[PDB]
Structure 1
Amino acid sequence: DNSYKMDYPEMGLCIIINNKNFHKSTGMTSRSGTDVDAANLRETFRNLKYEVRNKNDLTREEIVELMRDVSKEDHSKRSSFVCVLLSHGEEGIIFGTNGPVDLKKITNFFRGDRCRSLTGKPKLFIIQACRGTELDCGIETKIPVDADFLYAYSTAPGYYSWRNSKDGSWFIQSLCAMLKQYADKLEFMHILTRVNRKVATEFESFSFDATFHAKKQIPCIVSMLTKELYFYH
């Protein structure tokens, strides 16, 4: 068929790793307002009938162990899997409270051959974290083991990722608003495309210092899905 089977007895897990406070030896700063994103996500995915588990202030080892355990659960009665990461980042990596974790390490747990009860089911990774330090100035006007993954990144490779301490990050605030409005009408890729547009046109940084002023952001959809994804029917 053209569309993933989403009529399993359960939608699936939605794990949200929310890191705000970081260890002293890291020099990493606290991500103020991240709880806004975490709460917004929790409610959005609960409304999508996901079983949501929230984690807070996990270490790199704790992140690894959480994903290992979760990958070893029996997902046979679940349609999909969602993991949302809220943290500092670097290209290809997310930060535990006490140090880096390669993203590949945690998603390898769910590879078609390592988590058999999710083989052929959509595995979604939503990543609110930096991918580098670059700023966007803007401009005027048998199946493969690596299949059935989707990575919804807040930014393009190499780029910084913008957040508002009060309103939420640009990406998650837009993701939730778009899932809320369209998760009953549009296929996921088209939801995510609405997300890009909303982040691209509605947001623009403000700074008293020109270096950080009027900067822009586009999110980055990375799809290895083999079917269309509708959260209904």
Structure 2
Amino acid sequence: SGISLDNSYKMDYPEMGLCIIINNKNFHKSTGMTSRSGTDVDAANLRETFRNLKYEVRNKNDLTREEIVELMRDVSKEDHSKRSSFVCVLLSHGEEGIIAGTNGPVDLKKITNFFRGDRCRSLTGKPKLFIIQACRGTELDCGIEHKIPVEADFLYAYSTAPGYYSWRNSKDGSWFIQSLCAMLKQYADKLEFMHILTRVNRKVATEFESFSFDATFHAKKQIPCIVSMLTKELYFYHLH
């Protein structure tokens, strides 16, 4: 055959893969964490969006820290040999490096470690995408007018910059997930994933600004944060 290139991930396995959505809305009273109004809008939007990309979507609601860890351990022990990729979406409270279970925190590293190249062999060499809508701290943006590494082939699409709050609208859903689904719907058959996420960065940065009766929280902006350890271009489509 003719000259071949291998600059993009093979996305023509029989299955695109799993899309696990963990949607934590209601938290145990003792934690003091508030209910996350708007998050069901996000979860529904993500389900539809990834359905149209031919992912096998599994929605999970209000998981404890123990249930989150058990779920991701179990998913990492499935046979992903016939799947092109893996997607996990986390919708919760959080802080830098941490996602909230309904009864307490889980280290993000604990979750992602299950999918390391040496620990989930049927996903080795395949893109592993973690989409995280959660705070990463409490800063507010005021704006201005023969071997491969075990950490390779991960992409973390964070809703917000390190150290910062992340914004969620109780009616419309989170700024980031709103924007992410819109850009996937418009561009997934057209653009490489990093370019889609760059459009998401621009949409969040330009089209949203907080409104609050509290001056501390009013007129604030957000920029998401793309963290890529990918080794190839990622297109959700393939050529026949």
TM range (shorter): over 0.9
SS in 2 for 1:139: coil
**1:179 CA displacement:** 0.1
SS in 1 for 2:22: strand
SS in 1 for 2:220: coil
Unaligned residue ranges in structure 2 (runs of 5+): 1-5
| Residues 209 and 69 of structure 1, relative CA distance in 2, 3 Å threshold | same
**1:223 CA displacement:** 0.1
1:157 maps to what in 2? 162
Aligned Cα root-mean-square deviation (Å):
3.3
**1:129 CA displacement:** 0.1
Moved over 2 A (4+): none
In 2, the alpha carbon distance for the partners of 1:226 and 1:108 equals: 18
In 2, the alpha carbon distance for the partners of 1:209 and 1:121 equals: 45
SS in 1 for 2:37: coil
SS in 2 for 1:140: coil
Give the TM-score normalised by the residue count of structure 2: 0.96
Per-residue CA distance 1:114-147 (angstroms, 9 max, x = gap)? 0000000000000000000110000019110000
Per-residue CA distance 1:81-107 (angstroms, 9 max, x = gap)? 000000000000000000000000000
1:77 aligns with 2:82: yes
Which of 60, 63, 76 aligns to 1:58? It is 63
In 1, the alpha carbon distance for the partners of 2:33 and 2:211 equals: 22
Which of 76, 98, 123 aligns to 1:118? It is 123
In 2, the alpha carbon distance for the partners of 1:103 and 1:141 equals: 28
SS in 2 for 1:124: strand
| Residues 44 and 141 of structure 1, relative CA distance in 2, 3 Å threshold | farther
**1:72 CA displacement:** 0.1
- Please give the residue correspondences for 1:56-205 in structure 2 after superposition, counting only pairs within 5 Å: 56-140=61-145, 142-205=147-210
In 1, the alpha carbon distance for the partners of 2:198 and 2:210 equals: 21
Per-residue CA distance 1:41-86 (angstroms, 9 max, x = gap)? 0000000000000000000000000000000000000000000000
| Residues 141 and 194 of structure 1, relative CA distance in 2, 3 Å threshold | farther
Which of 210, 213, 219 aligns to 2:218? It is 213
SS in 2 for 1:43: helix
In 2, the alpha carbon distance for the partners of 1:19 and 1:210 equals: 28
SS in 2 for 1:101: strand
In 2, the alpha carbon distance for the partners of 1:207 and 1:10 equals: 44
| Residues 64 and 141 of structure 1, relative CA distance in 2, 3 Å threshold | closer
In 2, the alpha carbon distance for the partners of 1:33 and 1:149 equals: 28
Per-residue CA distance 1:143-196 (angstroms, 9 max, x = gap)? 100000000000000000001011110000000000000000000000000000
**1:211 CA displacement:** 1.1
In 1, the alpha carbon distance for the partners of 2:146 and 2:117 equals: 43
**1:6 CA displacement:** 0.2
**1:209 CA displacement:** 2.2
SS in 1 for 2:71: helix
**1:24 CA displacement:** 1.2
**1:25 CA displacement:** 1.1
In 2, the alpha carbon distance for the partners of 1:189 and 1:75 equals: 24
Q: Name the % identity.
A: 99
SS in 1 for 2:47: helix
